[PDB]
Design a protein around this ligand. Sequence first.
Ligand code: NI
Length: 207
Amino acid sequence: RMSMVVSGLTPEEFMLVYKFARKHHITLTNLITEETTHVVMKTDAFVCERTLKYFLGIAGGKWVVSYFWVTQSIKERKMLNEHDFEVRGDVVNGRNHQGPKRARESQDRKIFRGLEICCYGPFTNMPTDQLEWMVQLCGASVVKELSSFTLGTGVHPIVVVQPDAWTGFHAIGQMCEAPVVTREWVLDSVALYQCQELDTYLIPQIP
Ligand code: NI
């Protein structure tokens, strides 16, 4: 069906989404879920902020759409095409880049294909369980302990760390045999819907 969540709106703006939702019988919810079909983003004239809802949207291959879908629809008295209003970027990517699109289409082939990820140590402006949920939506398998990575040569483990929230270490590598990367690895990867090369995000491991 149609189920929307909203991000970056003022209350007045949200009321217009609410109005639109009434005229159309679309569901409007506070929290994103799997049922959520739509993520309505405040854009600048379709570049938005990178929010959790933005990530959980691309990650779920959803309709991540500019608030312009709504106003323009209201202004024309009917539901326009999501296609025409799809967001295209934020700060991992300026306008062009069609992250939500790569995403919305790919679903067979997901960016975290056959990976094992340990979100490790403390994180900030995003709860661990939401980063983990994101990571699964993208295809990864979640691992909770450094020591529980599967010993089957079949998979690729990865440790994810947000170096700030700590004071994890560059000593992770002493405790396992996985590349250790920063959270942006996942976040940039998710925005673009393109598994990014680890090189740029890899963190120093002390022998
Ligand atoms: Ni390999």
